[PDB]
Design an enzyme around this catalytic site. Sequence first.
Site, PDB file in Angstrom:
ATOM      1  N   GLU A   3     -20.091  35.512 -47.627  1.00  0.00           N
ATOM      2  CA  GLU A   3     -21.362  34.355 -47.093  1.00  0.00           C
ATOM      3  C   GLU A   3     -21.781  33.345 -46.193  1.00  0.00           C
ATOM      4  OE1 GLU A   3     -22.374  32.693 -51.265  1.00  0.00           O
ATOM      5  OE2 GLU A   3     -22.352  34.228 -51.920  1.00  0.00           O
TER       6      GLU A   3
ATOM      7  N   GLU B 199     -20.536  26.259 -59.176  1.00  0.00           N
ATOM      8  CA  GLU B 199     -21.923  26.728 -59.114  1.00  0.00           C
ATOM      9  C   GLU B 199     -21.969  28.215 -59.649  1.00  0.00           C
ATOM     10  OE1 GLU B 199     -24.962  25.834 -56.987  1.00  0.00           O
ATOM     11  OE2 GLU B 199     -26.553  26.620 -57.904  1.00  0.00           O
ATOM     12  N   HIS B 200     -21.460  28.287 -58.937  1.00  0.00           N
ATOM     13  CA  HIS B 200     -20.697  29.598 -58.914  1.00  0.00           C
ATOM     14  C   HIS B 200     -19.992  30.208 -60.188  1.00  0.00           C
ATOM     15  CE1 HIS B 200     -21.396  29.043 -54.950  1.00  0.00           C
ATOM     16  NE2 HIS B 200     -22.239  30.793 -54.534  1.00  0.00           N
TER      17      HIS B 200
END
Lengths: 436, 39, 49, 62
Positions: free
Chosen positions: A137, A60-61
């Site tokens: 993250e 998705e990134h």
Amino acid sequence: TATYAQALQSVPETQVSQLDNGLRVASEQSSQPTCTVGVWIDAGSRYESEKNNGAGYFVEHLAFKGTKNRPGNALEKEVESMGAHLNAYSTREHTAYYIKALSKDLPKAVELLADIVQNCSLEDSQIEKERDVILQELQENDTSMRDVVFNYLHATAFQGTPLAQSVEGPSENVRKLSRADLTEYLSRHYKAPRMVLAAAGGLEHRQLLDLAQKHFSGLTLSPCRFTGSQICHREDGLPLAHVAIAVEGPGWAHPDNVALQVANAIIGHYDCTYGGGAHLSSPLASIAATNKLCQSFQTFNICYADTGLLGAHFVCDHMSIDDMMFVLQGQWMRLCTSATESEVLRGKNLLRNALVSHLDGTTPVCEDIGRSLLTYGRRIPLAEWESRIAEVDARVVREVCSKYFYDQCPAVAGFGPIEQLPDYNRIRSGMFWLRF
Amino acid sequence: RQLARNWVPTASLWGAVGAVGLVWATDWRLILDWVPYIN
Amino acid sequence: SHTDIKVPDFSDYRRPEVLDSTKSSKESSEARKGFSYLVTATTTVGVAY
Amino acid sequence: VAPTLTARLYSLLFRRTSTFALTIVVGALFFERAFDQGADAIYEHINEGKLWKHIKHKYENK
């Protein structure tokens, strides 16, 4: 004019249109200069293998890092040159791609959106960047106990099926991923029927369907295990312990899917700074605040394809934790026997109040369509909801909870300072009354 | 109010039980043999 | 960070009707669990006797 | 496929507390009446002619 009885009648309806390769088209007119276009994808985390986990997330990134036709960050400038907001998101089942925009610049949008839907620039330039960014993250995600405790709960019952696994998956595959698997997982699950397309705004259907415009779309699930169990991670440093509790429930589509909506409408929810005060009607909202047996609590309801989740999520100081647990249960149990019509009215009213207010703004309708299609398909039973609501009866309720609560097997999700948490076997012999 | 729910039947179900208890205890009567009863 | 935790299986503990992860617990639950409570009641009988 | 008695019986009795307790209170009655009777022979069937129940048949009703 407007009457809540009349207002159910006057609606722009959802539209239905098919493509040949399996993509679905749909639309509604907001008589609006702006429109929310989106794309929904049913590719679930539970489809990916264990090695494949976290990929789509990682993927998705990658989307807006530049695409096959349009390399990195020439993409954003255009949408920015337009001035359009752009966003996307993921979920264990579902991934989203969507844009808020005027109806004017609509034509590029699709052909912009379309390109990246499948055509993707695949370059190791990003692979390490994102990996590091993600490793950044992943280690940072430990900050919010909330998002922490969830995943434990999945693995608690849903161990044995991919359903329980992390969206973002193990830290190791984050390092260990080659974009082959990506392309491979790009390959498998991005053909239709998996694909679903919609948008909402001032757009009528046909002026969409024309410019739905010749580009492309496309060319397994299992019952997940429901396990009565516990998870305890005891850590004494932090001030508070996020604790929530749950039992499994029905799938998306089912009549019972309705009754459960009002079920949680009954309990209500309390947190610190609500203006609620002691006079609240909900028994725990008043009482668990009275002694502040909780700093906060809420409930959750989510129904998967073949599965559903029921329970509440609460926060309180540790020395008193026992209280909530004792005093949460009956608020289920007393329903199961003694429950009442009038008490539901408000909740009957609330859920009515709830769904109606859901409809403000362009985007929310757009999002609805996608899940609806992935869930009930076309269905927007708008007025029918009320009819679905009018179904409800005191017996109806006392029939429902009879199923899923009285003497069942719950699972336990908890995080330090768990310490005083009543032991399991209490909770179990604590679920069903002895009649007291 | 009163909505007197399955509790009423529940209640109806409670006392019925131990009523047997007395009979089953040692302060009841002699029913029709009704499965073996010695003379 | 961890996110990895789990116990591989409890099988030797666990029991036939749950022996499949692709089966719904609601299936076995009714009869299976009753078997549990079953021990409760009958064992109370001799107590009265 | 039909539910085995347990699935039935649980839904029938063990679920509702009283109902659960009820047959429990019921079962013992016939039980002991059956139990007291059936066991005695086992004692007695072994013990034969040594007791006036057997013996006094020699002289009983004269």
